[PDB]
Design a protein around this ligand. Structure first.
Ligand code: ATP
Ligand code: ADP
Ligand code: ADP
Ligand code: MG
Ligand code: MG
Lengths: 22, 501, 467, 47, 187, 469
């Protein structure tokens, strides 16, 4: 579950761009 | 919205695999020549690196000829083709009803994704000789001419053949719309789950079609596959089998289906291109040697399973376009010698005003008396004989006078019957209303009424029977025969009505 | 010997043996399938490779599968236990009744009887049908041809011929369904089960059905008439008896051959047909002959594409036909059943050297009177009965009586008319017609003869309905 | 709807374009170790 | 015809036929290794400017080329098999594609001795200790006896991870494909 | 990258690359040519080769010339700066007026709009032509087609449709002549300058032009259609406008494909046409549909070899049209210009829900009467007209009246017939045909209805004909 590097990288970037909205 | 796209990311499959692989040697005209793939099954789905698909059609000793499922602009000599191990298969189920899917069962409707659970091959074999049982039930098409003179039982292939713009798709769509009354009612032994495969048409035409079906609220039970003109040749050669498998699911699940290929003379052209480019030997009109096996192994899945295999069914109405009544061309005869009938449409009749332009002289159904309800059987036997008598002496019509009163009677009956068979567009009629009209027609309750007015009468009569004597119609429908009481009641309604008009 | 597949181009496989090749026409079993896939060699391409035509769907074949050479051409069971069964081209039953337990096997590719075997005397096969045995007599070991479409009583005529031959001549029958619609295949199976030619209970069936469906790949619709021929060659040779052989249809035989020839890459011939059309038809129509052990008659349905009687397929078939039986719709409206047309039905043996002078004079007189009546029909229709003298009205009355007397009640058709099946022997037909022509019965009402067997029953019917 | 469609179809492109430049960092050792482990598992499950 | 021993790998075309013939003929008489040595030798001997120039002109009578090849093959003292093969190629006129033959034959001998092709395309430069672990783990894919012939390749065009080919088996764990796969899945 | 020419057979050049191959459909620039020569890749022959069709004559090509891979398919200028500018297949001006100064380039090989984008609305268009507006009404923003052999009137009819709709149309327009005469090319150019739709002084032009007239090599006639289509596709998508797209012919496109198919090593299909006829036509005729982003009203003049409508080219094209208006030579040799065949002509918007009961029933009465007249002609040829019935001669006279009334004098045909152009609003056509069918003009001579606009002109002509009697 934690192994995926680029997948969870996409997830982290989506969280960051989510916070950017507001 | 980002809160929504992270479950989009999570719901993926990141894992990798040890997979086989070949490399393209050549490409062009939509035909890759992959090299390698030593363990590739004939007719198997391979995937190119760029993302396209392919169906490894031609296993030659040194290379495998794959046919790309799309523009090969994305492919180059050197690319990697990774096999998947799976023959071509498609989703099925009742999740498709109301959707629009492409040749591979991918929703091209927007409107969300398909939620099907079960998939199914596309190259299955037809049921054998024992599973089938004789064709007995009728498929009410809602069209007066089709439903009385050239009947269509459930489990029967019935070619719809005719020149361009004579009303073939219109017949198929009237058939689709008619099933609403059944698919809204209760009994599950009369529900038909129409399917409509659109091959070679342009997306504007399929869009207008789905608009008609939605207006008539006839999509809640229809699937609409579509391999439209811009979709590469393999996706048109393969759409009919996707449709026929979506229908085989119902058939072997004890349900009743109905599949309309439109046209098949464009699947044949797509297959001819696929072959000529793979360099397979050509034949008459350049079609390969399989253009009979092609159709035959398709139109032979339309069966009527017995009661031990479920009791399901799958009608089939392949639409064929003939170049100026050239029924002797290759494909028209290939598909006329596979099916159980033909509903011939002609353009001399379409412009004389006989719409639907069916040509009862050439149209036949090889089940015949069966595949009709006893009521419609009683009416249509006499109607068929009367029309046959009319046709053979219609040549004198232009004179009429100067002739024996017997042939004058024959013409004065045939004209009324011909005018009764004229029908509107997307106005199918339940069987009992057809029986009422054709009873008023064949028993002489119009011979003294001028032909020009018959159409009026027809409509008026219907409105005067639908809103007044629904009990009589229900009596005819629930038991599909005309008991002497019902016969006399019909006579009284017809006579008294005609008197007051 | 085990070769390996090396190519799968459509329905044409190519197998690469090493140790020793199989001679052309051997059947190879493809190892690793669940349904029995059988290839049949058709060429040798050098380099220990053979191009085989596949007898079933070739999806899922992998370059490298093992193909095991059987040793002899496609082999089928041919005992008497193949009676009342259905079996596909390779001899595998498809009636869901179990294995066809037989002690014999026969290869479907056997050469025609040598010249010494051929029998030199042209006999006449007594079918027991008045019209057929009178105007278009069927010859033993002759390739009859049955024209006419559907709705005119063709399946009923087939079942009646089967029954009559099984009773009169004590000879079994066969039914090779070349390209046989699956729906119509099932309907024919159940029609026979009804009429009783096939019998599921006691093993006293008179037909050995053979079906190459319309969806089976082309290589397995050409070799189904050969399966029927082998099943019937067993009865002719190993049991010395007459046999029927219905090949419905004999245009789909040429169609299957043409498709196979195109697949093997051969240049198309005149109209797109295979270059070997004539020889392909010959090497199958030449086993249907009367040797000294027995005989194989054959009633082959014919489709004439686009009404072209010059088309190479119906032009290559007619070079073999020894008869004809033009079922017509116009004669079914009158109710005269069988619908066999008397004026179109030809026959090569309708010659006084073979049938006999009496038979020939009677048949020619019937034909002439029927032609004259057909002509007078036009005058009557145009002008009226008045326009005719009695020198013509007598011929009209005789012609109506004859047209009636040609109708016969079949045994299998009891379900329709209720009447009893009458197997009128040849002599009775000849006497009846020779007498109706001699005016001996010009007074009986026509309905005396309608649907009767001999003439004596017509007399009895006249007496009954005249009181 | 239209606004949401525009929003999401821009979000996807923006973030993927950020990622295709974020991968240029120095995480190579982790990727190589993970891939060698994947080889371990594939070889084990490949026979 | 006489039974012949098939190669381990199949090559197709003209070179395929000639290489198969030579390999089957060499397996009999067991002269495979020295046959490959002589094939490599003729490789260069057919690249000298005069020979490579006179064996392309089509106006040198065929018999002239055959005799010149025979004379050259006496000086180089080839085995009967290799001299016969050079002759054969000479008079069939197919010597213009001699390099295709020997190359194919090499691929026919490599698999005979069991050295499966491999390849590891990397996201960027790679260490050699990493290459050590790579070889030691890829050896886990072979059968019992085979050998690994790994041809590394650097590739920054991919994003991360690596692409490993082994014979045909192709395993792709490059971050680039992961990115496009994810974008596909969540689109 | 940079490859080399290895073979030059006819108008097909095989180029060998040592670097990375260029994907299919790219554009390759052959170096050292006085006039820019652009090849398009169409195959990958294997062995690091490609095979390309050349868009200009292959004179002077030398085995070994260096060839530069452009990188992307043929890119052409687009925008409102290509209005009133003639263009090549490769978007380079051929009007001797200097480069096309634009900002956006577009690549001609795009994809079709997908099903979710199709627009399902349709409403009649008024062309001011009696027969067309009556029996085959033209859907606005819907593909149209003008079949018919040679010399029947396809070009004159397209000239009329331009003359009327173009000026009477707000949004831009494009005319993409594919493989037709060059004389007509400059005739159109001059006519449009006269009309003012093209101005050589201001930026007020409304029509862009594209020309691959038939002196160009086959490689450059299979693609000029795509150039014009690209320009119009831009005016639809990016400019959010309404576009008229005239193509003439669009059979030269399939013919020019057929000309090179054989050299590309392809077995030839039915009638010598390339095996890929249907899909090559589909991938083009489905970038012309109206979508939810903009509207294209596409009028295409489709040749018909030897007036055979069964030929694979027109037979295939019939599936890609809304309104098909089949001109006939049997009717053009009676002087009934436009030659339209009232019975072969068809339209998708001929349903009473979209034209109403009056128009629908008028048209169906017209068709019924014409077909009945055809049926009688079989009889009049044995009897003679006198021996007919008395109710028939009425129908034959009515059919002749209608058949003559469907003719019309065109604004561009003032030089052929010497007449004056006429337009007829739809309501008036319906009025006239209602009256003719009802018998209200059964007393007038037939020659009163020949080459007249509204019916009132028919009565005036009947007068002026009876005066000089
Ligand atoms: N029952 C009818 N009454 C009146 N008009 C009809 C009827 N049936 C069909 N038409 C007309 O026929 C025209 C063609 O109809 P349809 O598309 O069904 O034929 P088609 O052969 O499928 O056309 P194509 O072959 O071009 O796809 C339609 O415009 C329709 O108006
Ligand atoms: N001897 C007969 N007596 C009465 N009716 C017959 C006779 N022979 C045939 N028929 C009629 O002809 C029809 C023939 O149908 P069938 O044999 O099933 O297929 P086909 O119509 O192709 O022959 C039957 O339905 C039957 O009513
Ligand atoms: N409305 C018309 N009135 C008179 N003649 C016409 C009309 N339309 C076309 N023609 C005739 O047709 C010829 C032009 O044919 P054209 O349309 O150029 O052929 P194509 O349709 O093959 O391009 C003219 O010479 C003219 O005689
Ligand atoms: Mg249609
Ligand atoms: Mg022109």
């Amino acid at each position: 579950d934690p192994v995926q590097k680029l997948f969870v990288d996409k997830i982290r970037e989506y969280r960051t761009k989510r916070q950017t909205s507001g | 919205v980002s809160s929504i796209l992270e479950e989009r990311i999570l719901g993926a499959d990141t894992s990798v695999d040890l997979e086989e692989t070949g490399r393209v040697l050549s490409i062009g005209d939509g035909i890759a020549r992959v090299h390698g793939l030593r363990n590739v099954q004939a007719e198997e789905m391979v995937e190119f690196s760029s993302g396209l698909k392919g169906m490894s059609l031609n296993l030659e000793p040194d290379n495998v000829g794959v046919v790309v499922f799309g523009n090969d602009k994305l492919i180059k000599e050197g690319d990697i083709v990774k096999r998947t191990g799976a023959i071509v298969d498609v989703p099925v189920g009742e999740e498709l009803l109301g959707r629009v899917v492409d040749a591979l069962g991918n929703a091209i409707d927007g409107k969300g994704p398909i939620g099907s659970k079960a998939r199914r091959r596309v190259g299955l074999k037809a049921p054998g000789i024992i599973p089938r049982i004789s064709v007995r039930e009728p498929m009410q098409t809602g069209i007066k001419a089709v439903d009385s003179l050239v009947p269509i039982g459930r489990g029967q292939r019935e070619l719809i053949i005719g020149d361009r713009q004579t009303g073939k798709t219109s017949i198929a769509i009237d058939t689709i719309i008619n099933q609403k009354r059944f698919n809204d009612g209760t009994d599950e032994k009369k529900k038909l789950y129409c399917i409509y495969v659109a091959i070679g048409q342009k997306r504007s035409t399929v869009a207008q079609l789905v608009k008609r079906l939605t207006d008539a609220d006839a999509m809640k039970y229809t699937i609409v596959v579509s391999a439209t003109a811009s979709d590469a040749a393999p996706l048109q050669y393969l759409a009919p089998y996707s449709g026929c498998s979506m229908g085989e699911y119902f058939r072997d699940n004890g349900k009743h289906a109905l599949i309309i290929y439109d046209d098949l003379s464009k699947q044949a052209v797509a297959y001819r291109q696929m072959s000529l480019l793979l360099r397979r030997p050509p034949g008459r009109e350049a079609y390969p040697g399989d253009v009979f096996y092609l159709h035959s192994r398709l139109l032979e899945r339309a069966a009527k399973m017995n009661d031990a295999f479920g009791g399901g069914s799958l009608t089939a109405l392949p639409v064929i376009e003939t170049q100026a009544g050239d029924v002797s061309a290759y494909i028209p005869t290939n598909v006329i010698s596979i099916t159980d009938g033909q509903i011939f449409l002609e353009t001399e009749l379409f412009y004389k005003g006989i719409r639907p332009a069916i040509n009862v002289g050439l149209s036949v159904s090889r089940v015949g008396s069966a595949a009709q309800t006893r009521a419609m059987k009683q009416v249509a036997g006499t109607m068929k004989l009367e029309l046959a008598q009319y046709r053979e002496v219609a040549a004198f019509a232009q004179f009429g006078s100067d002739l024996d009163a017997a042939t004058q009677q024959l013409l004065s009956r045939g004209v009324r019957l011909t005018e009764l068979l004229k029908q509107g567009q997307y106005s199918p009629m339940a069987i009992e209303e057809q029986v009422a009209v054709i009873y008023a027609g064949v028993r002489g309750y119009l011979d003294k009424l001028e032909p020009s007015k018959i159409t009026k009468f027809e409509n008026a009569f219907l409105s005067h029977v639908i809103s007044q004597h629904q009990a009589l119609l229900g009596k005819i429908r629930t038991d599909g025969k005309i008991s002497e009481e019902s016969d006399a009641k019909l006579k009284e309604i017809v006579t008294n009505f005609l008197a007051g008009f | 010997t085990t070769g390996r597949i090396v190519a799968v181009i459509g329905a044409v496989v190519d197998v690469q043996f090493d140790e020793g090749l199989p001679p052309i026409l051997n059947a190879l079993e493809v190892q690793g399938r669940e349904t029995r896939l059988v290839l049949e060699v058709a060429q040798h391409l050098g380099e220990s490779t053979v191009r085989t035509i596949a007898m079933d769907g070739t999806e899922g074949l992998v370059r490298g599968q093992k193909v095991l050479d059987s040793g002899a051409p496609i082999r089928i069971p041919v005992g008497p236990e193949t009676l009342g069964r259905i079996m596909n081209v390779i001899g595998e039953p498809i009636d869901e009744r179990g294995p066809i337990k037989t002690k014999q096997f026969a290869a479907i590719h056997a050469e025609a009887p040598e010249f010494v075997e051929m029998s030199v005397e042209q006999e006449i096969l007594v079918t027991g049908i008045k019209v057929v045995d009178l105007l278009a007599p069927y010859a033993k070991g002759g390739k009859i041809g049955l024209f006419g479409g559907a709705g005119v009583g063709k399946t009923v005529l087939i079942m009646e011929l089967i029954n009559n031959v099984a009773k009169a001549h004590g000879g079994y029958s066969v039914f090779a369904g070349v390209g046989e619609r699956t729906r119509e295949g099932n309907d024919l199976y159940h029609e026979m089960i009804e009429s009783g030619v096939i019998n599921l209970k006691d093993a006293t069936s008179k037909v050995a059905l053979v079906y190459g469906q319309m969806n089976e790949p082309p290589g397995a619709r050409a070799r189904v008439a050969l399966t029927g021929l082998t099943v019937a060659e067993y009865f002719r040779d190993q049991e010395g008896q007459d046999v029927l052989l219905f090949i419905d249809n004999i245009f789909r035989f040429t169609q299957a051959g043409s498709e196979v020839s195109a697949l093997l890459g051969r240049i198309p011939s005149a109209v797109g047909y295979q270059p070997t059309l004539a020889t392909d038809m010959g090497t199958m129509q030449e086993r249907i002959t009367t040797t000294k052990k027995g005989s194989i008659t054959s009633v082959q349905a014919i489709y004439v594409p686009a009404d072209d009687l010059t088309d190479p397929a119906p032009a290559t078939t007619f070079a073999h036909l020894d008869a004809t039986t033009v079922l017509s719709r116009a004669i079914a409206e009158l109710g005269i059943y069988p619908a066999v047309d008397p004026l179109d039905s030809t026959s090569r043996i309708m010659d006084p050297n073979i049938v006999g002078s009496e038979h020939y004079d009677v048949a020619r007189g019937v034909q002439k009177i029927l032609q004259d009546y057909k002509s007078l029909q036009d005058i009557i229709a145009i002008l009226g009965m008045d326009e005719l003298s009695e020198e013509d009205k007598l011929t009209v009355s005789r012609a109506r009586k004859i047209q009636r007397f040609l109708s016969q009640p079949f045994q299998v058709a009891e379900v329709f008319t209720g009447h009893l099946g009458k197997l009128v022997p040849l002599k009775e037909t000849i006497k009846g017609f020779q007498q109706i022509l001699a005016g001996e019965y010009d007074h009986l009402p026509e309905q005396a003869f309608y649907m009767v067997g001999p003439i004596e029953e017509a007399v009895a019917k006249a007496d009954k309905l005249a009181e | 709807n239209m606004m949401r469609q525009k929003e999401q179809e821009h979000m996807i492109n923006w973030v993927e374009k950020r990622v295709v430049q974020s991968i240029s960092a120095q995480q190579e050792k982790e990727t190589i170790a993970k891939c060698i482990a994947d080889l371990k598992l594939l070889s084990k499950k490949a026979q | 015809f006489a039974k012949l021993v098939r190669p381990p790998v199949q090559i197709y075309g003209i070179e395929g036929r000639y290489a198969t013939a030579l390999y089957s003929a060499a397996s009999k008489q067991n002269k495979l290794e020295q046959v490959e040595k002589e094939l490599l030798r003729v490789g260069q001997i057919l690249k000298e400017p005069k020979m490579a120039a006179s064996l392309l002109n089509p106006y040198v009578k065929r018999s002239v080329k055959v005799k010149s090849l025979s004379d050259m093959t006496a000086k180089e003292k080839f085995s009967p098999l290799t001299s016969n093969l050079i002759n054969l190629l000479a008079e069939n006129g197919r010597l213009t594609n001699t390099p295709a033959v020997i190359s194919a034959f090499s691929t026919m001998m490599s698999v005979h001795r069991g050295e499966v092709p491999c390849t590891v395309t990397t996201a960027s430069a790679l260490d050699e200790a990493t290459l050590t672990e790579l070889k030691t783990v890829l050896k886990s894919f072979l059968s019992k006896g085979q050998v690994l012939k790994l041809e590394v390749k650097i590739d920054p065009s991919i994003m991360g991870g690596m692409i490993v080919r082994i014979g045909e088996k192709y395993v792709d764990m490059s971050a680039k494909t992961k990115i496009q796969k994810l974008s596909r899945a969540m689109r």
